[PDB]
Amino acid sequence: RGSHMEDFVRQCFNPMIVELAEKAMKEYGEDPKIETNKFAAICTHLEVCFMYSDGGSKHRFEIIEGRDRIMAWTVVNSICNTTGVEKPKFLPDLYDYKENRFIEIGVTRREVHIYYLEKANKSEKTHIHIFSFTGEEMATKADYTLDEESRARIKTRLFTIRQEMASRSLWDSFRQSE
Ligand SMILES: O=C1CCCN1CC[C@H](C[C@@H](C[C@@H](CCN1CCCC1=O)N1CCCC1=O)N1CCCC1=O)N1C=CCC1=O
Ligand SMILES: O=C(NCCS(=O)(=O)c1ccccc1)c1nc([C@@H]2CCCN2C(=O)c2c(Cl)cncc2Cl)[nH]c(=O)c1O
Ligand SMILES: [Mn+2]
Ligand SMILES: [Mn+2]
Structure with a gap:
């Protein structure tokens, strides 16, 4: 099928x-x-995680998303046992070497506020950053990590994915699926 x-x-x-x-x-x-x-x-989500990790300096971010569960967790302990950060309960998506924190990236098609709240309850220390398909974003303590141009390019790409679906009439099924 x-x-x-x-x-x-x-x-x-x-x-x-x-x-x-x-x-x-x-x-x-x-x-x-x-x-x-x-x-x-x-x-x-994967592409956003990769564009994000490319937004900073050369080796600023450790990419944890996109690995097998066992290796992703192995890199988490090494980061923890090297930095002194506490181990998150759930696997994050990135580690920021500059700001010394784990980042949970979110991509939602609903309102940014609703999704942020749900993601918080599912790790106090992990930094959270949500992007919308409409162009909104919300980050923990209003700290957006990357500069405006790197975030803007992520938002552009998200809105283009949205148009490409709507042109094919798959958007509404995709929006009401979440
Ligand atoms: O430059 C570009 C333009 C678009 C495609 N591309 C590849 C570079 C990275 C992906 C990652 C992939 C890779 C890194 C290389 N490794 C290491 C383990 C096995 C593997 O594939 N992975 C996969 C999950 C964990 C991880 O970091 N990146 C980021 C670093 C260079 C690269 O390819 N990337 C950044 C934009 C989207 C995208 O895919
Ligand atoms: O990494 C993740 N999951 C594995 C580690 S976890 O510890 O289980 C974990 C579980 C929840 C949140 C974070 C980590 C992860 N998961 C989700 C959601 C919810 C769980 C299932 N799920 C998906 O299938 C999914 C989706 Cl809907 C969109 N994009 C990627 C993925 Cl995988 N959302 C992410 O943003 C994400 O990062
Ligand atoms: Mn993840
Ligand atoms: Mn995520």
Whole structure:
């Protein structure tokens, strides 16, 4: 059963993002051919995590998202046992070597405030940064980490994904899926 959303994902995101999203869904026991909206969301989150890590200086961020669970956790302990930060309960997405904190990246299609709150309850010390498909963002203590231009490019890319879906009439199904 092959959907339009699946072919759009593979044409919209680069093959390394796609393959990484596929590996993650197989690990949760989910199928990219069926839960195709979640497939698209995971790719999007992945690309945002990678654009974010590219926004700073050369080796400012450690990328924790996109690894297998065991290795991601191994890099968390090394960071913790080197910096003195406490171990998060849940796997974060990045580590900021400059500000010395873990970052949880969020990408939501609903209002930014609602999603921020839910993500907080699911780690007090981990910094949180949410991006919307409409162009909004909210970060912990109003500290947005990156400069304006790096965040702006992420928001542009998110709004382009939104248009590409709507042009194909997959947006509304994608928006009401979350
Ligand atoms: O430069 C570009 C333009 C678009 C594609 N691309 C590759 C560079 C990175 C991905 C990552 C990929 C990679 C880094 C290289 N490694 C190390 C482990 C195995 C592997 O693939 N991963 C995968 C998950 C953990 C991690 O860091 N990056 C960031 C560093 C260079 C690179 O390829 N990136 C940044 C923009 C989107 C994107 O994919
Ligand atoms: O890393 C993550 N999960 C594994 C580590 S965790 O400790 O289980 C973990 C669990 C929740 C939050 C953070 C870490 C992670 N998960 C989510 C959501 C909720 C859980 C399932 N889920 C997804 O399948 C998903 C989605 Cl909806 C969008 N984009 C990527 C992914 Cl994976 N949202 C993220 O923002 C994210 O970073
Ligand atoms: Mn993650
Ligand atoms: Mn995340």
